């Protein structure tokens, strides 16, 4: 449920005894945890929301000029004053201009004048700030079993219902026991800080279009500043790059405005992530986090339930996911009550030889009603399959044949783990989460090493990191004393793998 056909999902287990399943919660995929007990659970990060943003310096990219002024002065009488310049609403620059005979100025030679004009502007760039507090995570999770066609479509009553739950997380209130009447308590405690490395992030809204920007880049943009300001005529700062002054070969200086650079800041925005409904409530797309998840109290609701002997029937052609598993929605009337129902698979029967991954443990049916649809899934082994459902003779079976080999499973798992290794960096650790020694060792070694990788190879671009990896390779063959040339090979391969990022 809720995590099928959402590829980039994962399945994580926990070696039973001391529920310690710290998942790397994803705002761009789902994660399903399983346990021999403790009905299998999913978690998917719906949205990310920020409550309060502060109004740091704004920017203007659309300006307008008027009431120009030159204020010529003789080659020797000082240089131009132009009382206009007195005001800051005007932008002015002072230029040495030629002044000859038949030009006034009984002398002649290089004189000077100060060309300038009013700086009126429009289309401000509200570059607000946000901080790791009064931001807000909002997730929804779903246990399997009941709830034919889970399917967020009618989520409203599903958080009121038992199979789905909606959770809000604050850096003030990190804990949340996702309580499911009859199912469990789903203990959760997360790190609402180290998700997106906030406090270096600004919420820019330009043309009612919002996004997040690494505040360093936002500080480095050379447009006019509102600079902190509030109401009152905006005294724009630096006021110069926008307008452009130009004299003739020697004389008569004028000014151009260079219009609006809206699309220019767009093409300069080539790394930000866009963001939506903003109100006093600013929502944004993906951003990960670390969530210690505990199976403290999850009762499976119907381990004692009988296996009512009605004949079961498929409805939809149980296609499989990229993760190899396969979901089926099986309907049946014929019996009543809160039923337990069998679901196994085999290679031969007259054995039924229950084999393979059972994901949707304790599949439960609610009521006496007609052919309830009983959505669930299982995962077959690498060969042909025989998924068996009903009970015995009036059961229903079906071929599968996963067609995914065991070494192939390791392939998909390791390339997935490697992509995690890349994008989550340190956080890719404790993903399969037991508090084992080598786990904290990996966390720490990546901590120091990748932090150095940041501070040394600061924000290496696509092309940059590409050629850096290439020349590191070329050098990894050249140098003697493999000890360091192997380190060249290592960093170069790290760089190239970083260039194998999601971009493909």
């Amino acid at each position, epitope marked *: 449920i809720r995590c099928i056909g959402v590829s980039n999902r994962d399945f994580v287990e926990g070696m039973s005894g001391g529920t310690w399943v710290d998942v790397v919660l994803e705002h761009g995929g789902c994660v399903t945890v399983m346990a021999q007990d403790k009905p299998t659970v999913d978690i998917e990060l719906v949205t990310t929301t920020v409550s309060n943003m502060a109004e740091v310096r704004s920017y203007c990219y659309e300006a307008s000029i008027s009431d120009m002024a030159s204020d010529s002065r003789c080659p020797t009488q000082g240089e131009a004053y132009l009382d206009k310049q007195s005001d800051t609403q005007y932008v002015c620059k002072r230029t040495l201009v030629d002044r000859g005979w038949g030009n006034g100025c009984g002398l002649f030679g290089k004189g000077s004048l100060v060309t300038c004009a009013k700086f009126a502007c429009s289309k401000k760039m509200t570059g607000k700030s946000i901080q790791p507090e009064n931001l807000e995570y909002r997730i929804m999770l779903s246990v399997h079993g009941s709830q034919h066609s889970g399917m967020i479509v009618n989520d409203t009553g599903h958080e009121t219902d038992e199979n789905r739950a909606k959770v809000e997380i604050t850096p003030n209130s990190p804990r949340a026991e996702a309580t499911l009447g009859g199912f469990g308590s789903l203990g959760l405690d997360c790190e609402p800080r180290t998700g997106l490395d906030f406090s270096d992030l600004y919420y820019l809204t330009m043309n009612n279009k919002h996004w997040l920007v690494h505040k360093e880049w936002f500080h480095d943009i050379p447009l006019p500043w509102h600079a902190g300001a509030d109401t*009152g*005529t905006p005294h724009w700062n630096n006021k110069e790059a926008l307008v452009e002054f130009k004299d003739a070969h020697a004389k008569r200086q004028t000014v151009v405005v260079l219009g609006s650079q809206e699309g220019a800041v767009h093409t300069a925005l080539a790394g930000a992530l866009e963001a939506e409904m903003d109100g006093a409530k600013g929502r944004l797309s993906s951003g990960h986090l670390k969530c210690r998840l505990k199976m403290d109290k999850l009762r499976l609701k119907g381990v004692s339930y009988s296996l009512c002997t009605a004949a079961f029937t498929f409805t939809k052609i149980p296609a499989e996911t990229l993760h190899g598993t396969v979901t089926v929605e099986v309907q049946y009337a014929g019996t009543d009550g809160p039923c337990k129902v069998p679901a196994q698979m085999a290679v031969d029967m007259q054995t039924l030889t229950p084999v393979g991954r059972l994901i949707t443990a304790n599949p439960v049916i609610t009521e006496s009603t007609e052919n309830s649809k009983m959505m669930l899934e299982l995962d077959p082994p690498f060969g042909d399959s025989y998924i068996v459902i009903g009970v015995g003779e009036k059961k229903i079976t079906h071929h599968w044949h996963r067609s995914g080999s065991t070494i192939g499973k390791a392939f998909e798992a390791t390339v997935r783990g490697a992509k995690r290794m890349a994008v989550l960096g340190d956080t890719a650790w404790d993903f399969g989460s037991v508090g084992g020694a080598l786990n904290s060792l990996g966390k720490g070694i990546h901590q120091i090493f990748g932090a150095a990788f940041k501070s040394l190879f600061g924000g290496m671009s696509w092309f940059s990191q590409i050629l850096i990896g290439t020349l590191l390779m070329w050098l990894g063959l050249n140098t003697k004393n493999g000890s360091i040339s192997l380190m060249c090979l290592a960093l170069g391969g790290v760089l190239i793998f970083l260039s194998t990022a999601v971009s493909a």
Partner: antibody
Amino acid sequence: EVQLVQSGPDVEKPGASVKVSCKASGYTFTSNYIHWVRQAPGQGLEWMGVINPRGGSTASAQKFQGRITMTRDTSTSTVYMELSSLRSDDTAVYYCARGGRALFYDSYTTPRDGGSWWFDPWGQGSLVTVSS
Amino acid sequence: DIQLTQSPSSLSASVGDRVTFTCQASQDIRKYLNWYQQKPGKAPKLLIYDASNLKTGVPSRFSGSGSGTDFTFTISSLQPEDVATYYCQQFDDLPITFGQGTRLQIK
């Protein structure tokens, strides 16, 4: 006794500038954010802006950006409000009020408030009319 | 962004009645809400800070409550000095707005 006092009612030209004074009494003048709030005769109250008696810090709302100026006068413990480019809506009564933990120079509302948030010295109200 | 509706628009009641005013804002104003009552030609009357707190000197005839986005003020017993226009106003995010009003009348 903590108490604010405004200047007398005034009538101005459309497009002129009016300055209303607000003098404080009974407290250390540098410890209370002065809030200005407008009220049209039939309309409700709408907060105009805020100034800090210390350091002359200022802020307002966009309904007055470019016309409103707010200055301090530490000597007589006063704050002066100028509305510029007067307009037919300006005929109203304006109120000045002391507010909260005026520590440095700001509005500063993420921390606490109340305890006469800004309501002990609401003074008397400055009636202004804008016509010819 | 600070739109705050204050219901009803007006009311009129006899002496000794309870009356309640509601104000819901479009935003989250967790506890930064305040309440006044003002006569024409008056500085307003000490009613409520933080939407739940009685000020010193205020009669216990008044009370305020509400948590998330909508908040209720209440006069326990109506009295002749209760004729005024009542106002609720938020404190956060600083385009500070007030309600248009809730007006009273004795019968």
